[PDB]
Amino acid sequence: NFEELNSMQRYSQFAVFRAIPGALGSDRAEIVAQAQSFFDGLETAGKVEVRGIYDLAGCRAEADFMIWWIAEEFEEIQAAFARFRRETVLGQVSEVAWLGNSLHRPAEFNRSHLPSFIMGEIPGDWITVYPFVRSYDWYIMDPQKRRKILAEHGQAARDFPDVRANTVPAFALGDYEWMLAFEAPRLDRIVDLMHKMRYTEARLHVREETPFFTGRRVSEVSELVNVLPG
Amino acid sequence: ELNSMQRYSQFAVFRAIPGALGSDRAEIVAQAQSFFDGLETAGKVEVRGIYDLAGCRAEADFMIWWIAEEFEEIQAAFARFRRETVLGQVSEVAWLGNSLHRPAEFNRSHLPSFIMGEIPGDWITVYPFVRSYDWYIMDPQKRRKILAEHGQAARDFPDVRANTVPAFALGDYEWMLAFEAPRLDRIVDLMHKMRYTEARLHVREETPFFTGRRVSEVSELVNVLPG
Amino acid sequence: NFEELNSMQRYSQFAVFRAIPGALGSDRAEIVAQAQSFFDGLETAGKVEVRGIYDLAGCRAEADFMIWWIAEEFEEIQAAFARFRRETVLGQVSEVAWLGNSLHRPAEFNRSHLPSFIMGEIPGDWITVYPFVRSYDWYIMDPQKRRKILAEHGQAARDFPDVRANTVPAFALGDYEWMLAFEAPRLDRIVDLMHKMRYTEARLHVREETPFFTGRRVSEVSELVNVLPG
Amino acid sequence: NFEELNSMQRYSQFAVFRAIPGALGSDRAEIVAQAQSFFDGLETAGKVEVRGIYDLAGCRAEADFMIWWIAEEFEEIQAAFARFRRETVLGQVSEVAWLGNSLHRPAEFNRSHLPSFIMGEIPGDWITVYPFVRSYDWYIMDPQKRRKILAEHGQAARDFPDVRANTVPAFALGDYEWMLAFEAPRLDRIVDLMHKMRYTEARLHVREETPFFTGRRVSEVSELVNVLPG
Amino acid sequence: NFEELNSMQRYSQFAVFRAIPGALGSDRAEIVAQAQSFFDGLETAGKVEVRGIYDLAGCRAEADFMIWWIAEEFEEIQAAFARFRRETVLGQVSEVAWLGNSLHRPAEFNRSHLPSFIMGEIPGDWITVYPFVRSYDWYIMDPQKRRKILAEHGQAARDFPDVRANTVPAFALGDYEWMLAFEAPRLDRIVDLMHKMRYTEARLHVREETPFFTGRRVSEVSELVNVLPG
Ligand code: FEC
Ligand code: FEC
Ligand code: FEC
Ligand code: FEC
Ligand code: FEC
């Protein structure tokens, strides 16, 4: 129920990796098998929830893929992250490019606004993830003005019920105030959402929102491993 | 009327690794041409040009502009270029400029030169764009008037073809721009003249720029490189 | 005791390191032995006090661990820092990511505001460290007004007495004005403090506050070295 | 009026290079000879004119030397630049640090303002080169107001007839709007000119003007190559 | 007023280097003797005056030591800087991190304000060096208002006569407008001067003032060399 989801403690991490040319090679059948064994086991221990593994090929220089994983305790993401890097070839041959950490919290004025992953909704086939930093004046602004700006913001999104939002505090978990993730069945709906949301007063209260990471949720880690540069 | 076309457009900018190509490039070239010839036959990814960027900027050397109906088709081609060709193996990705063609806000005959199927220019400049935060909540007929005046400022440059394409959430930018022309100086002069527009008061970012010359085949580009 | 505490000379440095991929390897026993013998040697010399060694796993690309050490004279930190880099393999196989240097001073208006490390408090199990730079107008502002803004800033932290603050001048010891460290028993307390502190007039007088370094205090250097990426 | 000189087509490129420590060694006589041959070859083909080679030792980190060369067609500079890198050991043992490209055009108002290199003046013994970006409002501003401002700007340079300006459009040849190069017999004259030009209304209409490259024109390649780190 | 010291021509460079890990090793006595011979050779040549060599250990990532040297002609510094890098093993195993160049000039209003090094003062045991860039409106402000702001700025330092100032033009000698160095018997007085100088109206007319380089003047090259990482 809706207090329970608001009260829930869940850290969420987007871990973006870059491939190291030369490191992976071209014989990957066992690398694939080992990495799926690693995640299947994660799934079985029941502490870290891998919401998706995303192929970011062609999104940006210096990034190749992303793991989205979630846990009640940050220490459990730290452990999974450390093990991935140490106990799988995939993690050994990849560089950490960027880490987006966040912690679920009740929204300020609308307690029915909850991240897709907290709602337990099926993850979308396509995602864009990016951090966010608000104006300096945003939180100390008169609350009723912020409230109406956020209301208008939400109404501007109503044309996109198929795009699921995740707006999550990120204070002191890195350099940002929020971790944003939008999930959708087609990437053009994510592009068009971002374009439409420019038409809102809330854009007057924005300081940072890059880097973006956009890509395709793989059905299984084979699809990712097999595309990476060797 | 309504040109249907959904198209994604990517500018993939690569940096040559000094000392990686060396002097025996003929197998590298032949392998690279076979990759590109193979893309043409599959018929999903159209390569509008390969560009020599030599001398434009440090840390960039060449650029691939290819276009497809689904972004996953460009991901596969881009991944395949880097994975299965030595040319892709001995280069570094410097920058990726991604976009998705959409209709213009006000004037529905404003269409990118590649969507129109027009001949690619001998010379190209490519760069990203981010408007000021106040731009899209501006009164709509004001923004319409500004964009129309901005368009008029280019009438002396019919030989420069424009490509202004949404890039929201495909990277760090809002628009992907490419101007194609038969001579580089027409591009320099167009950008200079377009500064004399009210639209310039509503800009936040427009770098990095990539400017260079369209080559006829891979051989022409690869023989230029420092390797 | 507040006058002696306010008049004391103490430099504080946060030395943030990253591990060089491929440098540590599997045989790490001499490295740990040599490492703790370095830190034991520091404690017996009695000059440089290690408040904590912290594992920053999961926090950000390009940083893996942090040392927090304190000394009456900066040249003693210089000597300890250089010795770590020069005479330990752990320091030899690590890259310096960032240094946050500071010198304790009395606060401007409230002289009972003192860093936890100066108060001799037990360090917290979790930490976040970040530099701070005020707006150009902050110091030349009317003192009554800056004083009232700072008192409201302090009151906004009223529900986080378990989060211990260290706000320490950093002028001319790097690119910053202040070095901040917040110490707590659980990470979520740190995140929520930062979130609530956004609702303050002080936020209209801020220029820079990144990068952030967040992680967990380890009980000894053994626990750190065996967690690091290989 | 200067109608022919205003109408000529000339691209101008500043190619800045960084020496790779350890790459040259100390047996440089043949590296020099090969480099001299390459510049000999460019004179002979008559398409690319080298106005100067500059020793930038001590100006800034990560640059060591610069070539200023000029051609009617950009592709002639492209070919010669690429050939320097690909077909001489000096270019092979150097990294490109930064490129500043430009294309001469008539001035907006004072058509007697023409680059030193376009006028055919002897190149100065000392040079400073930097790119330039005007404020967003500069070109859409009322022409009468921009004309007044540029008139005051030219007048502020009245005491420096010995410092020769090259103010050359750079739109779409890079990240900048103008390429600036100031040539003089003495470096102090350039420092003093730059200082004096801060006293102009035009400074209220500036957005970017770094990096700077300042250095000493050499007589021949041997003078530069013998300076470089081995 | 101080006409001859105000009239004289001196270029001043701060040359900051970072050690290259792995390069120096543990065999250093002959590296030191050679470097001392190179510095002896400079003093006997009588053109380049080394005011100090500074241990920067622990100040910031990617910097380790600094040379401060001074000469009537900038090509003399260029030659010494290049000879250091090319012909001493210490120069060869070091990377240039940052260069801060400047040219002495008379102050705008107070001709009794002169750099410590121009006045022939013994160098301080501790230094902080940093570049500076004023606001775009600073130089075109009414001169009587800028004069008053600078006089109040000077008065704010009245309590720190022990911290000696060098405020030197840097236009066209890099990316900045001024090169600042503050030298003192004690580091803590430098920190406190910087803090106190925030309480000035001049602070409303600042654009840039980083990177900072802070450290201790060594008596002998051996003192520096023996602390660097191997
Ligand atoms: C996209 C996008 C961005 C980033 C780009 C931009 O700046 O526009 C974006 C930015 C943010 C940011 C920060 C916050 C954090 C709160 C703050 O104080 O900023 C943030 C927070 C909220 N958003 Fe937001 N958003 N957002 C959607 C998409 C985007 N949103 C869609 C879609 C919906 C609608 C679907 C849903 O509610 O789940 C939606 C609604 C809300 C609500 C609920 C509003 C209401 O009361 O109606 C809250 C709270
Ligand atoms: C160059 C250049 C830039 C970037 C530099 C600058 O800011 O000046 C530049 C920037 C943009 C940007 C963003 C947009 C996207 C819409 C927005 O809301 O920004 C953007 C959009 C439009 N542009 Fe634009 N431009 N632009 C041309 C060149 C440049 N344009 C030339 C040439 C023509 C002439 C027509 C053609 O040949 O296609 C032209 C016309 C249009 C029209 C059609 C307007 C009309 O006539 O009603 C639309 C829509
Ligand atoms: C968190 C955080 C930041 C950075 C983020 C932000 O800007 O909100 C933050 C920023 C700063 C900065 C700079 C300064 C330095 C003085 C200045 O002129 O900025 C700075 C200085 C002070 N803080 Fe501060 N803080 N701060 C706390 C947490 C944060 N603080 C908590 C908790 C408490 C309460 C507990 C305690 O005093 O120990 C607290 C109180 C004070 C007091 C005492 C106030 C009083 O008289 O009531 C002074 C002085
Ligand atoms: C130095 C310096 C800078 C960069 C730093 C700053 O912004 O102060 C500097 C910046 C620029 C820039 C961009 C432009 C390009 C036009 C624009 O629209 O900005 C630019 C353009 C002009 N400048 Fe300029 N300058 N500048 C000189 C030095 C500097 N100038 C000296 C010397 C002379 C005088 C000698 C000569 O005519 O050749 C001089 C004169 C002119 C004239 C002719 C004006 C006149 O005399 O009526 C034009 C046009
Ligand atoms: C520290 C510090 C900074 C940088 C931080 C800040 O912005 O406060 C700092 C910044 C600058 C900068 C640029 C300039 C260059 C001129 C300009 O137009 O900015 C610059 C120039 C001057 N400073 Fe300055 N300073 N400064 C001192 C310390 C600092 N100063 C101390 C100490 C004294 C006093 C001792 C002395 O005269 O040498 C002192 C005084 C002067 C005078 C003499 C003023 C007078 O009484 O008429 C001039 C001229």
PDB file of C-alpha atoms in Angstrom, chain E residues 42-177:
ATOM      1  CA  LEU E  42      72.102  29.151 -13.509  1.00  0.00           C
ATOM      2  CA  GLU E  43      73.351  31.316 -10.653  1.00  0.00           C
ATOM      3  CA  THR E  44      76.828  31.688 -12.140  1.00  0.00           C
ATOM      4  CA  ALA E  45      75.372  32.554 -15.547  1.00  0.00           C
ATOM      5  CA  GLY E  46      73.621  35.457 -13.748  1.00  0.00           C
ATOM      6  CA  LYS E  47      70.537  35.648 -15.978  1.00  0.00           C
ATOM      7  CA  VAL E  48      67.954  33.480 -14.185  1.00  0.00           C
ATOM      8  CA  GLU E  49      67.363  33.979 -10.448  1.00  0.00           C
ATOM      9  CA  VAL E  50      65.812  31.028  -8.612  1.00  0.00           C
ATOM     10  CA  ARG E  51      63.797  32.563  -5.792  1.00  0.00           C
ATOM     11  CA  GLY E  52      62.732  29.192  -4.496  1.00  0.00           C
ATOM     12  CA  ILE E  53      62.124  25.502  -4.986  1.00  0.00           C
ATOM     13  CA  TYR E  54      58.989  24.378  -3.145  1.00  0.00           C
ATOM     14  CA  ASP E  55      57.791  21.064  -1.757  1.00  0.00           C
ATOM     15  CA  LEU E  56      54.091  20.895  -2.738  1.00  0.00           C
ATOM     16  CA  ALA E  57      53.555  17.403  -1.305  1.00  0.00           C
ATOM     17  CA  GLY E  58      49.955  17.019  -0.177  1.00  0.00           C
ATOM     18  CA  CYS E  59      48.612  20.273  -1.644  1.00  0.00           C
ATOM     19  CA  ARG E  60      46.705  18.868  -4.632  1.00  0.00           C
ATOM     20  CA  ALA E  61      46.408  15.898  -6.928  1.00  0.00           C
ATOM     21  CA  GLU E  62      48.798  15.913  -9.884  1.00  0.00           C
ATOM     22  CA  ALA E  63      51.372  18.351  -8.537  1.00  0.00           C
ATOM     23  CA  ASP E  64      54.510  17.716  -6.501  1.00  0.00           C
ATOM     24  CA  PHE E  65      57.021  20.566  -6.738  1.00  0.00           C
ATOM     25  CA  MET E  66      57.545  24.071  -8.007  1.00  0.00           C
ATOM     26  CA  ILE E  67      60.391  26.231  -9.239  1.00  0.00           C
ATOM     27  CA  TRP E  68      60.037  30.016  -8.922  1.00  0.00           C
ATOM     28  CA  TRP E  69      62.552  31.816 -11.104  1.00  0.00           C
ATOM     29  CA  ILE E  70      62.952  35.273 -12.453  1.00  0.00           C
ATOM     30  CA  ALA E  71      64.767  36.903 -15.307  1.00  0.00           C
ATOM     31  CA  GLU E  72      64.982  40.159 -17.236  1.00  0.00           C
ATOM     32  CA  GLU E  73      64.058  38.511 -20.539  1.00  0.00           C
ATOM     33  CA  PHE E  74      61.439  35.814 -20.970  1.00  0.00           C
ATOM     34  CA  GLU E  75      63.609  33.863 -23.467  1.00  0.00           C
ATOM     35  CA  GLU E  76      66.125  33.401 -20.603  1.00  0.00           C
ATOM     36  CA  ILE E  77      63.392  31.609 -18.616  1.00  0.00           C
ATOM     37  CA  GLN E  78      62.329  29.664 -21.701  1.00  0.00           C
ATOM     38  CA  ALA E  79      65.933  28.479 -22.116  1.00  0.00           C
ATOM     39  CA  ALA E  80      66.384  27.502 -18.453  1.00  0.00           C
ATOM     40  CA  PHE E  81      62.973  25.808 -18.353  1.00  0.00           C
ATOM     41  CA  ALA E  82      63.819  23.835 -21.489  1.00  0.00           C
ATOM     42  CA  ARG E  83      67.356  23.041 -20.280  1.00  0.00           C
ATOM     43  CA  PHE E  84      65.926  21.708 -17.009  1.00  0.00           C
ATOM     44  CA  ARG E  85      63.568  19.380 -18.884  1.00  0.00           C
ATOM     45  CA  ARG E  86      66.092  18.296 -21.493  1.00  0.00           C
ATOM     46  CA  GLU E  87      69.441  18.054 -19.689  1.00  0.00           C
ATOM     47  CA  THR E  88      68.738  16.995 -16.072  1.00  0.00           C
ATOM     48  CA  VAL E  89      67.441  13.596 -15.101  1.00  0.00           C
ATOM     49  CA  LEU E  90      65.123  15.339 -12.624  1.00  0.00           C
ATOM     50  CA  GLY E  91      63.634  17.317 -15.519  1.00  0.00           C
ATOM     51  CA  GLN E  92      63.273  14.131 -17.560  1.00  0.00           C
ATOM     52  CA  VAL E  93      61.389  12.075 -14.963  1.00  0.00           C
ATOM     53  CA  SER E  94      59.013  14.982 -14.161  1.00  0.00           C
ATOM     54  CA  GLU E  95      55.905  16.186 -16.027  1.00  0.00           C
ATOM     55  CA  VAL E  96      55.003  19.851 -16.445  1.00  0.00           C
ATOM     56  CA  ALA E  97      51.688  20.318 -14.642  1.00  0.00           C
ATOM     57  CA  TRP E  98      51.071  24.057 -14.790  1.00  0.00           C
ATOM     58  CA  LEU E  99      52.991  27.174 -15.677  1.00  0.00           C
ATOM     59  CA  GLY E 100      52.289  30.591 -14.198  1.00  0.00           C
ATOM     60  CA  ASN E 101      54.011  33.444 -16.017  1.00  0.00           C
ATOM     61  CA  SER E 102      54.021  37.152 -15.283  1.00  0.00           C
ATOM     62  CA  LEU E 103      55.711  40.473 -16.044  1.00  0.00           C
ATOM     63  CA  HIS E 104      56.252  43.109 -13.338  1.00  0.00           C
ATOM     64  CA  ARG E 105      54.516  46.460 -13.871  1.00  0.00           C
ATOM     65  CA  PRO E 106      53.812  49.567 -11.752  1.00  0.00           C
ATOM     66  CA  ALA E 107      50.544  49.388  -9.904  1.00  0.00           C
ATOM     67  CA  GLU E 108      47.676  51.414 -11.271  1.00  0.00           C
ATOM     68  CA  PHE E 109      47.265  53.861  -8.426  1.00  0.00           C
ATOM     69  CA  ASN E 110      49.694  53.116  -5.604  1.00  0.00           C
ATOM     70  CA  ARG E 111      53.229  53.136  -6.959  1.00  0.00           C
ATOM     71  CA  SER E 112      54.544  52.115  -3.546  1.00  0.00           C
ATOM     72  CA  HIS E 113      52.871  48.725  -4.029  1.00  0.00           C
ATOM     73  CA  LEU E 114      55.582  46.437  -5.444  1.00  0.00           C
ATOM     74  CA  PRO E 115      56.191  42.671  -5.431  1.00  0.00           C
ATOM     75  CA  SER E 116      58.239  41.203  -2.595  1.00  0.00           C
ATOM     76  CA  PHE E 117      60.761  39.857  -5.102  1.00  0.00           C
ATOM     77  CA  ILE E 118      61.147  43.225  -6.820  1.00  0.00           C
ATOM     78  CA  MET E 119      61.837  44.847  -3.458  1.00  0.00           C
ATOM     79  CA  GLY E 120      64.614  42.331  -2.894  1.00  0.00           C
ATOM     80  CA  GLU E 121      62.957  40.787   0.130  1.00  0.00           C
ATOM     81  CA  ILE E 122      64.104  37.375   1.375  1.00  0.00           C
ATOM     82  CA  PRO E 123      61.580  34.741   0.206  1.00  0.00           C
ATOM     83  CA  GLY E 124      59.086  33.305   2.635  1.00  0.00           C
ATOM     84  CA  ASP E 125      59.337  29.814   4.100  1.00  0.00           C
ATOM     85  CA  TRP E 126      55.771  29.123   2.901  1.00  0.00           C
ATOM     86  CA  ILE E 127      54.043  30.227  -0.285  1.00  0.00           C
ATOM     87  CA  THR E 128      50.728  30.058  -2.034  1.00  0.00           C
ATOM     88  CA  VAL E 129      50.670  30.785  -5.759  1.00  0.00           C
ATOM     89  CA  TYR E 130      47.568  31.234  -7.858  1.00  0.00           C
ATOM     90  CA  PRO E 131      46.369  32.998 -11.009  1.00  0.00           C
ATOM     91  CA  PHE E 132      43.676  35.649 -11.048  1.00  0.00           C
ATOM     92  CA  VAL E 133      41.096  37.051 -13.484  1.00  0.00           C
ATOM     93  CA  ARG E 134      38.975  40.108 -12.651  1.00  0.00           C
ATOM     94  CA  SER E 135      35.375  40.628 -13.659  1.00  0.00           C
ATOM     95  CA  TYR E 136      34.757  42.039 -17.115  1.00  0.00           C
ATOM     96  CA  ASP E 137      33.534  45.323 -15.556  1.00  0.00           C
ATOM     97  CA  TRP E 138      36.622  45.878 -13.374  1.00  0.00           C
ATOM     98  CA  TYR E 139      38.895  47.894 -15.666  1.00  0.00           C
ATOM     99  CA  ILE E 140      36.162  50.098 -17.142  1.00  0.00           C
ATOM    100  CA  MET E 141      34.715  51.044 -13.736  1.00  0.00           C
ATOM    101  CA  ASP E 142      35.155  54.749 -12.914  1.00  0.00           C
ATOM    102  CA  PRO E 143      38.844  54.955 -11.926  1.00  0.00           C
ATOM    103  CA  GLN E 144      38.058  56.766  -8.631  1.00  0.00           C
ATOM    104  CA  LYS E 145      35.750  53.920  -7.638  1.00  0.00           C
ATOM    105  CA  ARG E 146      38.293  51.231  -8.505  1.00  0.00           C
ATOM    106  CA  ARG E 147      40.959  53.226  -6.630  1.00  0.00           C
ATOM    107  CA  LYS E 148      38.764  53.355  -3.523  1.00  0.00           C
ATOM    108  CA  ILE E 149      38.028  49.615  -3.752  1.00  0.00           C
ATOM    109  CA  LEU E 150      41.737  48.826  -4.043  1.00  0.00           C
ATOM    110  CA  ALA E 151      42.570  51.086  -1.103  1.00  0.00           C
ATOM    111  CA  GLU E 152      40.010  49.278   1.093  1.00  0.00           C
ATOM    112  CA  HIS E 153      41.356  45.999  -0.225  1.00  0.00           C
ATOM    113  CA  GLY E 154      44.818  47.097   0.866  1.00  0.00           C
ATOM    114  CA  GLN E 155      43.553  48.205   4.270  1.00  0.00           C
ATOM    115  CA  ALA E 156      41.996  44.789   4.920  1.00  0.00           C
ATOM    116  CA  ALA E 157      45.485  43.253   4.856  1.00  0.00           C
ATOM    117  CA  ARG E 158      46.931  45.744   7.349  1.00  0.00           C
ATOM    118  CA  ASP E 159      47.166  43.086  10.078  1.00  0.00           C
ATOM    119  CA  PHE E 160      49.300  40.742   7.946  1.00  0.00           C
ATOM    120  CA  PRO E 161      52.574  42.646   7.226  1.00  0.00           C
ATOM    121  CA  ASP E 162      54.346  39.291   7.717  1.00  0.00           C
ATOM    122  CA  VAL E 163      52.618  37.861   4.604  1.00  0.00           C
ATOM    123  CA  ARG E 164      54.417  39.410   1.621  1.00  0.00           C
ATOM    124  CA  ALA E 165      52.468  39.929  -1.601  1.00  0.00           C
ATOM    125  CA  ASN E 166      53.446  39.620  -5.275  1.00  0.00           C
ATOM    126  CA  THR E 167      50.605  40.784  -7.527  1.00  0.00           C
ATOM    127  CA  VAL E 168      51.976  40.661 -11.061  1.00  0.00           C
ATOM    128  CA  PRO E 169      50.458  41.140 -14.561  1.00  0.00           C
ATOM    129  CA  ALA E 170      49.988  37.937 -16.510  1.00  0.00           C
ATOM    130  CA  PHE E 171      48.138  39.134 -19.613  1.00  0.00           C
ATOM    131  CA  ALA E 172      49.052  37.180 -22.769  1.00  0.00           C
ATOM    132  CA  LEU E 173      51.543  34.987 -20.808  1.00  0.00           C
ATOM    133  CA  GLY E 174      48.914  32.312 -20.379  1.00  0.00           C
ATOM    134  CA  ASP E 175      45.206  32.186 -19.632  1.00  0.00           C
ATOM    135  CA  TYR E 176      45.089  34.742 -16.861  1.00  0.00           C
ATOM    136  CA  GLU E 177      45.291  38.393 -15.966  1.00  0.00           C
TER     137      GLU E 177
END
